[PDB]
UniProtKB/Swiss-Prot annotation, chain A:
It is found in: Nucleus. Testis-specific chromatin protein that specifically binds histone H4 acetylated at 'Lys-5' and 'Lys-8' (H4K5ac and H4K8ac, respectively) and plays a key role in spermatogenesis. Required in late pachytene spermatocytes: plays a role in meiotic and post-meiotic cells by binding to acetylated histones at the promoter of specific meiotic and post-meiotic genes, facilitating their activation at the appropriate time. In the post-meiotic phase of spermatogenesis, binds to hyperacetylated histones and participates in their general removal from DNA. It comes from Mus musculus (Mouse). Belongs to the BET family. Signal peptide: none annotated. Interacts with SMARCE1. Interacts with mRNA splicing machinery proteins SRSF2, DDX5, HNRNPK and TARDBP. Interacts with the acetylated N-terminus of histone H1, H2, H3 and H4. Interacts with P-TEFb components CDK9 and CCNT1/cyclin-T1. Testis-specific. Expressed in germinal cells from the early meiotic (pachytene) spermatocytes and during spermiogenesis in the round and elongating spermatids until the condensed late spermatids. No expression seen in spermatogonia. This is Bromodomain testis-specific protein. Brdt is a promising target for male contraception. Treatment of mice with JQ1 reduces seminiferous tubule area, testis size and spermatozoa number and motility without affecting hormone levels. JQ1 causes a complete and reversible contraceptive effect in male mice. Residues 8-117 form the Bromo domain. Disruption phenotype: Mice are viable but males are sterile, producing fewer and morphologically abnormal sperm. Aberrant morphogenesis are first detected in step 9 elongating spermatids, and those elongated spermatids that are formed lack the distinctive foci of heterochromatin at the peri-nuclear envelope. Spermatid nuclei show a fragmented chromocenter. Bromo domains mediate interaction with histones that have acetylated lysine residues at specific positions. Bromo domain 1 mediates binding with histone H4 acetylated at 'Lys-5' and 'Lys-8' (H4K5ac and H4K8ac, respectively). The bromo domains also recognize and bind a subset of butyrylated histones: able to bind histone H4 butyrylated at 'Lys-8' (H4K8ac), while it is not able to bind H4 butyrylated at 'Lys-5' (H4K5ac). Ubiquitinated in a SPOP-dependent manner, leading to proteasomal degradation.
Length: 123, 7
């Protein structure tokens, strides 16, 4: 075989993912990332229809928790949760909502960083 | 319809 072990590359890639998550949680992005630090509080916000339209809520805090608990089998799985988070926002809010603009700015950060993970994501 | 209000 030789070369690098697949389990090692996956771990390296998940480490890059952790670093991307850390980047997204930095104070630098606070102006447009804060709405995604925690789960959306439908109750406290009066969004009585949030869990109706959004079947799988997601947020940076939860993704951070799953990463810390070694729950992602690979980078694609991590990416899916990040995109789910943005998808939820685009689906629940009106296209012109201020939070949508913030999501897209934060997604600009994510996509540009994720894509620069050395080589291409392994399964 | 409800709408989220960011602060």
């Amino acid at each position: 075989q030789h070369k690098v072990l697949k389990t090692v590359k996956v771990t390296e890639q998940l480490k890059h993912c952790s670093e991307i998550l850390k980047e997204m949680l930095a104070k630098k992005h606070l102006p447009y990332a804060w709405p995604f630090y925690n789960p959306v509080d439908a109750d406290a916000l009066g969004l009585h229809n949030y869990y109706d339209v959004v079947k799988n809520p997601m947020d940076l805090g939860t993704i951070k928790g799953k990463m810390d608990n070694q729950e992602y089998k690979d980078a694609y799985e991590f990416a899916a949760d990040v995109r789910l988070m943005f998808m939820n926002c685009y689906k629940y809010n009106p296209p012109d909502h201020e939070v949508v603009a913030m999501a897209r700015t934060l997604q600009d950060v994510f996509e540009l960083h994720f894509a620069k993970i050395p080589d291409e994501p392994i399964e | 319809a409800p709408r989220k209000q960011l602060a």
